[PDB]
Amino acid sequence: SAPYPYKVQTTVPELQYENFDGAKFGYMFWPVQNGTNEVRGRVLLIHGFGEYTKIQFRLMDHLSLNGYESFTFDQRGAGVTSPGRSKGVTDEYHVFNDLEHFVEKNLSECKAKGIPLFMWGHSMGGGICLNYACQGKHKNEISGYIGSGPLIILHPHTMYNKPTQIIAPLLAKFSPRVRIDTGLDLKGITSDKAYRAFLGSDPMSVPLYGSFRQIHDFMQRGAKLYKNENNYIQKNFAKDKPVIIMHGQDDTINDPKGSEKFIRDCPSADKELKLYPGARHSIFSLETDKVFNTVFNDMKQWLDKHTTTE
């Protein structure tokens, strides 16, 4: 198959397992490896639909080099956590209940070190991340929220070409356990053909199954934020918690309109949207070196700013 285009510079952590609520979660703890020892903070990574640990290698590697710990886990319905039958089998309840478990785990481990815990999410993970800031049990304990092209509203290009993504949530209630594979939009995901070749050949990426229940729940998740009925965001967003959304300008999978409106509606004093020209969907994982460097540096500087002491 096609090789993983990125060369990891630090030591790749042990793929670790932990049982919770009837699922064996695969997870990784990526330690700071930059010669100095010290840690400025830890970032919890919430992957997107169809993603898993390896996809966030590029991000965790760079974070490790710049004094930041990472924690990620294959969520229920994805990765090595839910193979075969269970692939795509999850719902709104499990999504956040599983999340609370791993938040408290990292919170406990960061408690001893006295280091801040940040939350990061891409696409589907971005929608989960921004929602956790509104509904999370420990939303006021998270030091900052980072969204990577968060799934708020689909881009018209995706809705027109993949109408099944509209039908599946519509038929979810009636037929929840129907699982479906819509295929990867490689051109929409990234502009770099090197990562395109890898993704299309990656056995852990293809095929990609999702249940109607799963799909409906993260589709509705984002729509809830976009509609913002009765000022849901203003009322429930964790008071004055730093937010930053990073979103490719040429993203034709998740509409930049969603991120623009979310930042507008967000009541926090420390909020920002960054749009990246020439960039597409997977800006933190599968895009070009030029795009990734620009995108990661903004995140790195943003993290430093919210861990600056003396």
> What are the C-alpha distances in Å from 16 to residues 83, 255, 310?
16, 35, 35
**The two structure tokens encoding residue 157:** 């290009």
* Beta partners for residue 271, in sequence order: 243
Tokens (6 digits) for 253: 């999978």
Q: How many CA atoms lie within 13 A of 286 on its CB side?
A: 31
Is 62 noted as a catalytic residue in this protein? Answer: no
* Annotated catalytic residue 123: yes
Domain boundaries, the chain: 1-310
Please state how this structure was obtained: X-ray
Tell me if residue 251 is catalytic.
Answer: yes
Integer Cα distance of 140 and 210 in angstroms: 32
| Catalytic-role residue among 61, 217, 251, 255 | 251
> CATH number of the domain at 1-310, please?
3.40.50.1820
Cα(102)–Cα(69) distance, integer angstroms: 15
Please, which residues have CB within 8 angstroms of residue 209's CB and are 6 or more apart in sequence? 87, 88, 179, 180, 181
CB neighbour burial string for 180-196, b if at least 16 within 10 angstroms, e if fewer: bebebbeebbbbbebbb
User: Does residue 53 contact residue 72 with C-beta atoms inside 8 Å?
Assistant: yes
Query: 230: Cβ–Cβ under 8 A, 6 or more apart, which residues?
Result: none
Q: How far is CA 230 from the centre of its chain?
A: 26
Secondary structure, 3-state, the chain? CCCCCCCCCCCCCCCEEEEECCEEEEEEEECCCECECCCCEEEEEECCCCCCHHHHHHHHHHHHHCCEEEEEECCCCCCCCCCHHHCCCCCHHHHHHHHHHHHHHHHHHHHHHCCCEEEEEECHHHHHHHHHHHHCCCCCCCCEEEEECCCCCECHHHHHHCCHHHHHHHCCCCCCCCEECCCCCHHHHCCCHHHHHHHHHCCCCCCCCEEHHHHHHHHHHHHHHHHCHHHHHHHHCCCCCCEEEEEECCCCCECHHHHHHHHHHCCCCCEEEEEECCCCCCCCCCCCHHHHHHHHHHHHHHHHHCCCCC
Tokens 């809830």 belong to 224
Catalytic one of 64, 82, 123, 259: 123
Structure tokens at 183: 């295929």
Dist. CA 80–CA 54, nearest whole Å? 11
Tokens of 245: 């959304």
The resolution, in Å, is: 2.5
